[PDB]
Amino acid sequence: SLQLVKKFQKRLEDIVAYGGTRNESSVRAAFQQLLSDWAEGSGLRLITEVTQKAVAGNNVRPDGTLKDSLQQSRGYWESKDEADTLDDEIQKKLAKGYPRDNIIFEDSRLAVLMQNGEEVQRVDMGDAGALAGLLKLFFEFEPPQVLEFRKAVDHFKDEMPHLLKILREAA
Amino acid sequence: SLQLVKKFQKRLEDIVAYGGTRNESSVRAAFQQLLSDWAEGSGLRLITEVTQKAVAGNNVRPDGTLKDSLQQSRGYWESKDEADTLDDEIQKKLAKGYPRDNIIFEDSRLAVLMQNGEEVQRVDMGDAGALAGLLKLFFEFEPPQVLEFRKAVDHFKDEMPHLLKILREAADAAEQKADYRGERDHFVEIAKEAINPDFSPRDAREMLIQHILTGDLFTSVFDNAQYHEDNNIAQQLQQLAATFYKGPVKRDIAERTKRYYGAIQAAAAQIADHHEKQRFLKALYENFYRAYNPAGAERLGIFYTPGEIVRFMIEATDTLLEKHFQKELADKGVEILDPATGTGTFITELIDFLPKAKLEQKYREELHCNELALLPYYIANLNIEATYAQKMGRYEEFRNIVLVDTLDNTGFSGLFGSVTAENLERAKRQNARPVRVIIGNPPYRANQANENDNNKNREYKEIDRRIKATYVAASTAQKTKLYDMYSRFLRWATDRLKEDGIVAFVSNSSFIDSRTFDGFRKEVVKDFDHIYILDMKGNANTSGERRKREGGNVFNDQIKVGVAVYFLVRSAKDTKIWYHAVPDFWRAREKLEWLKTTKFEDIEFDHIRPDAKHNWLGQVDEENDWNEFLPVADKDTKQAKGLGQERAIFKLYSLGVVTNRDEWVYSRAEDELADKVRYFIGRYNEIIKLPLGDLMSRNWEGDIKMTRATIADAQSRKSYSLEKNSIVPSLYRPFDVLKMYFSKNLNEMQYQMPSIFPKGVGENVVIALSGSPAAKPFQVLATDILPSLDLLEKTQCLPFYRYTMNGERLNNITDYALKAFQTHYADTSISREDIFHYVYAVLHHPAYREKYALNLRQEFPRIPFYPEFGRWAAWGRELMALHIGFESVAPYPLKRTDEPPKNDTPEALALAKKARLKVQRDAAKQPTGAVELDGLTTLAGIPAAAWAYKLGNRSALEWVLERHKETTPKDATIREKFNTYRFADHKERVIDLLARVTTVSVETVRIVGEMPAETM
DNA sequence: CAGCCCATGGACCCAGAACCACCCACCC
DNA sequence: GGTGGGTGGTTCTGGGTCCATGGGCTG
DNA sequence: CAGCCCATGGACCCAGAACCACCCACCC
DNA sequence: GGTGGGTGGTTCTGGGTCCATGGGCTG
């Protein structure tokens, strides 16, 4: 919701004001709550710091992983410190094998979504309408499983005549 | 394999020869057919020109995709023309979106395999061996789904406790419906005559929770819902479950257990090989019992057999069937039975071994099985039925599995297996079958761990009567542990095999070298004609260098007992005992890889020739003059006051006091002990006033350690009372003088010690020694305080005096000894006290301990007549002084250094006053001469020689440190109420003892080094 | 003949430590 | 910009007990 | 009453037609 | 090395019939 994005924008201000620190560890709670509360309405849950074995045998631990009810990863998130070049730091993490299926790399001021290994959208987190749009894409990404399910439903239609032969013979 | 790659090369040359074209479209049919035929053997199939959407949305079409039965791609192949650059073409195709998960970029000349996005192997297609390797890797690549299933199986193990909570609550809410109680009462009474005479409603709720849990996963993960519908035993238990598990009750349980079943179902649905999914059956089996009934898992035995052992045991029974009975496992007439199926691993791997041509007949009337528990029965029947279905295409129900106690069904008239009627028929048919191979992993369990568990092994009258009349009768051992569940299965086997055949079992390897198994080693060579033992070591109940030599358990290091794969063949000279032991210091992996890569024929066995004491290994040398005196003999001890069979140095000998409740009877302080005993006597007195029903069924709260003796006198309503003159000092471990309550009421066996040290406090000196058969090195230590059975291994104390009933200290050194010594040395000066000190010295002599080592390990230490005598009894007067008065020897100068706590937090001090008592060692694991006592005090300056007074596998100093560490009491009551030992209160006393014992150690090492370098 | 001595070997498991990933303070 | 350190996770690795309980004795 | 007249709107499907993908032949 | 056929698959896309069957005559 835009209301959820607007509360993140306030939470972030308070963390740097009531806390005095702009360290990523302290400021990440604002987006963690945004992602967690959006997910609670979409039938998913953001589980934080879950380790995933990368393709190079190494283990990578993103700041958060969106997980379904079958404990299946549907999305990822890695926050950085605003005191860095997001673009440069995205490359370092992606070269250590950080997943590139549906990942939101996010410094406190700018958010990047890389769905299917390609940057779908880069927004500014000061704009509520823009972040809400980028988050919608991330939360509504169609994983390969649902596309394979659709493909097999289409094969079942053409293979129905042949299944009904076996069942007719039985009767 | 090689054959197919050779045909590939034969086709490639003939396509360019008979066709005169090098175009990819024509030369690709060679590799297409190589891959297609290799795939047909691996259960996959190469489909050609299958389109696939790439990430960027470009439909890419490789030259072929490897597909499984679930129509899922598990590999790809793209051939190019040889008139090109493979690396350049790979790069361009990859950039078009070509998958890199598992792809063979083929060129008529060379082929590269890019697995996981990275080149793994590039070979030349002109090599029949290199292409065979590349293709093996392509057709055995583990897809992402296989790895994500193994992750899910591991997580289900940890969530099984929580899942069984939902199911337990359900079975409890069923005990309110009278329909359930009525059916349960019918089941308990039909299972009290079929399974266990003591089947209880608690056992029935277990079988229900098993039927429910497995009747959900069989329909979800394994997709065999029909199994439960058609299984004979499942229909009897659905009749008890359909009294409650239905409608909204089932819907509620299903919605709360879906969070524990969701992940495995997701991953399992993408796996087609039953061989991969069978790891879940193995995990449900083991973990269910660990989380629900951890005690019943001990009774039944719930450990699966690593497949490597079962495959070796199947291959070897075949080599041995040919060599002795000129038959084969596949031949008609060879009926195989698995007495304890478990997960059915033995019968599933036999299905894989036997060829498809004979499998049908083998499956319908030759392979037989038995099981006692429901979850194992269900898991096995499904495993066996699905291995046949995957191999032979069609599904046939296995009708040769019975739910029966193998040892109870010895009807070769009982209602054993009368759970249902088809079960009873299967039991009677199996009894009549002519079994020739009995293969399996018998349950092993010698005794219960503590008497407070009330989990004693069941008694089997028929089988136990056979063991007493055969194995136990032939044994000369005082304690028979031949009633182990594995020796009961070994008796049953020798009896089920009525004519000729093999009994291939993997069991505890005590039979090869254990005093209790003397009678088995005598009887088994009469029943069998060829015995082939293969020791896999693994005994973790050992310590020190032995533990290191034993190595890892071939059972994935999950058990601590020694294991041996043995094959006992009876055909129709003398029995040939062949033996091969796995190398020492091997890890479990190394031991299991050997079994997978070795054939029975290649193994080099050694002909064991049993000795007259029926020992197969550890046979002593005979060229020695070991017939030299005798410290003590069972005859001298039981001599009937005639001084005619007094043929040993000492007359009476005794084992140290065993209490059976060491945590309740021994304490570092007198006050703490009196308080601990007070609680015991108090709670016992409340137990003796209970209904006879509760008394006889041991139905009391177990807050005190009740042993056989106590349980007997609590049913005899006897009343204990605190006699306060029973707290006496006692050497518990070397250089560890605790205090003990010496009462015949609270000490199980005081042995003959009420004669050595009467009333616990008495005047005597005992040369304590290790007993036989010893596992730790020979150890001898003199004491003036009551010893314990575990001061040294099976401590056998030899006293100097002997107190008669209300009598004098009759000298225990015999007159035969005195006269013999006064004769060899020819000096009547020799007195009994000189002989006492002579014996001590000889037993400390290093060369005697080395030469007669195997003798010392199996007998009472016989004493040589060393030339001098004077010098020896002198050395032994010094040794005994240091050892007995170790509390008075000069403290060696040790430098104490003290450091302050890290911070000033109250908790730092507390954490730093905790005992560490560790020998600071260097990188060569050799002592640096310092001991970190606690986080603050550190003593240093210990000489290196002081680490060599090794009493056992631990040095004297390491013994003092170990027996002063703050170790949590195993007993719960003592842990909660009587745990008041803080090293802080004993730090100064330890600083003193460590110094005194440093002197004892360096002095002993010196005296022992002055002794000669040769033994008479 | 029922107490009373005499063995004898046992179907794991869990604390140190290494080392690794990540981020924050700390130099640099 | 590493670097060490704070914190939490993830593999390995090493290393070892009191005490049940049948049988023989035995007065 | 059966035996003539008179309406009146209908729960798809499929042949081209691109247009790709791949690759042999054909120039270049 | 592009470049146009050759071959096969993979998406759109455009574009449109005779004839059931009740009710009203009708003689």
Ligand SMILES: C[S@@+](CC[C@H](N)C(=O)[O-])C[C@H]1O[C@@H](n2cnc3c(N)ncnc32)[C@H](O)[C@@H]1O
């Ligand atoms: C440790 S498992 C044997 C392992 C199995 N052979 C394997 O390879 O997977 C022992 C099994 O024997 C079964 N069993 C069958 N009859 C038995 C009997 N009479 N006594 C004890 N266990 C018995 C138990 O239910 C238990 O599951």
Ligand SMILES: [Ca+2]
């Ligand atoms: Ca982060």
Ligand SMILES: [Ca+2]
């Ligand atoms: Ca190709």
